[PDB]
């Protein structure tokens, strides 16, 4: 009835067109066979068509289509569709990343003359972790440091964040729960006989992997140590925890799948001919990436390798998995997109505007892959075509020591951890903002 309302209050002119004379419902039914790019053009033919093409339930569907699940709201006349403004807002954001003028980013100076070893981004809070022994909580909206988490004696190397709870890991073989609001250590977790290297936080439990070859499952609330997973020869490099199984990757070339409650090792995955360094897990598939340049896809329920994906030429550092699409970053300067169902390498992200050194990090979504590198750049790529789009960041020092360690992206901003082993680049975060005004 938002359209009936519109008709009698605007009272458009008489029209001699098929859809103006069709019963209003059958017109919408015809208008529905169109793609949003068409609806947007159709809305500019006449006032009657503009009114018809603002049917809320026609756009609630185009959003559900494109994975837009919430309407947008704002604060003669027009009755705008919130689903339609929601849809446009997103197409504008996408265009902003893709070809929007790059507004100079907020510079977040900190961790002077040290590395940013781990990075978290939740809502409006950024958490940088460093070998300076400290962690720092920032606002993505203001660029101001709000808390410096001092308490660790060795250097921070792992991190996890839910909501105002921060976990940290260090060379001091302790973990630490923190109040992101009050920068207050609430728990110090003891038990690891080596550096606390990786951690993964499911809900009220974090699993930690250590240089001592063990993992420990901890209770974020109480601070207890629920179990200790023992079976790894070499140090434990990467960990994943879905709440039902722990999957771990060790310098001993092995992937281990645990049932934590029983402290039992359910599977030892054998195949990697070198140290496994990176891991993804979706409750069904384990994906491991090795210093042996291969990536393996295993069935968690049988321990069976399903695919061994080859083609990378060096250490697969970071991986991201999402609905059976996998994206891998490697020291070979290349990023690959894979279909872990079929094993096919969908795309190799290289070309004339490829990375010049190793890929340090990546994020992706249904449209884009964001890659960072020691060449001092952050690149944006078309996930669907594999094509280079543009450099979002280009450190002037990229060729002489400038480096991008790590990136986190939201729908509207990109956070970059930047620095250098040699003074060319003051260490800092860059925060890019791709939001649109509406």
């Amino acid at each position: 009835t938002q359209v009936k309302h519109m008709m009698q209050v605007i009272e458009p002119q008489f029209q001699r067109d098929f859809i103006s004379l069709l019963p209003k419902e059958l017109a919408l039914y015809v208008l529905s066979f169109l793609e949003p790019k068409d609806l947007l053009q159709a809305a500019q033919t006449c006032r009657y068509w503009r009114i018809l093409a603002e049917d809320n339930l026609l756009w609630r569907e185009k959003c559900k289509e494109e994975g837009i699940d919430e309407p947008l709201h704002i604060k003669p006349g027009f009755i705008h569709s919130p689903w339609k403004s929601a849809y446009i807002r997103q197409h504008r954001i996408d265009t902003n990343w893709r070809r929007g003028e790059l507004k100079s980013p907020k510079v977040l100076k900190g961790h002077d003359d040290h590395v940013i070893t781990c990075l978290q981004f939740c809502g409006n809070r950024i958490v940088s972790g460093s070998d300076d022994n400290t962690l720092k909580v920032w606002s993505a909206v203001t660029g101001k440091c709000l808390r410096t988490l001092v308490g660790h004696t060795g250097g921070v190397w792992s991190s996890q964040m839910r909501d105002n709870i921060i976990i940290s890991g260090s060379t001091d073989r302790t973990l630490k729960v923190w109040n992101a609001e009050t920068g207050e250590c609430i728990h110090t977790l003891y038990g690891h006989t080596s550096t606390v290297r990786c951690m993964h936080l499911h809900e009220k439990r974090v699993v930690s992997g250590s240089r001592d070859a063990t993992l420990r499952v901890w209770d974020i609330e109480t601070g207890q140590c629920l179990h200790v997973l023992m079976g790894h020869v070499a140090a434990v490099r990467c960990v994943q925890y879905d709440g039902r199984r722990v999957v771990s990757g060790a310098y001993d070339f092995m992937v281990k799948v645990w049932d934590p409650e029983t402290e039992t090792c359910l599977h030892t995955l054998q195949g990697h001919t070198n140290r496994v360094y990176s891991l993804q897990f979706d409750g069904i598939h384990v994906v491991s990436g090795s210093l042996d340049t291969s990536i393996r896809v295993w069935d968690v329920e049988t321990g069976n390798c399903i695919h061994t994906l080859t083609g990378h030429q060096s250490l697969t550092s970071g991986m991201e998995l999402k609905d059976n699409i996998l994206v891998s970053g490697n020291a070979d300067s290349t990023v690959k997109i894979w279909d872990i169902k079929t094993g096919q390498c969908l795309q190799t992200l290289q070309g004339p505007n490829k990375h010049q050194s190793a890929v340090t990090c990546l994020q992706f979504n249904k449209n884009f892959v964001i890659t960072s590198s020691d060449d001092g750049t952050v690149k944006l790529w078309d996930l669907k075509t594999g094509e280079f789009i543009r450099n979002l960041v280009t450190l002037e020092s990229g060729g002489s020591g400038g480096v991008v360690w790590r990136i986190r992206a939201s729908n509207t901003k990109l956070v970059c951890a930047v620095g250098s082993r040699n003074g060319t680049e003051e260490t800092k975060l860059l925060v890019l903002d791709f939001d649109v005004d509406m």
Binding site: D131, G155, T171, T195, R197, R211, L315, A331, A358, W405
Partner: peptide
């Protein structure tokens, strides 16, 4: 190569 904790 890349960053890693110092060996103890």
């Amino acid at each position: 190569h890349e960053e890693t904790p110092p060996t103890t």
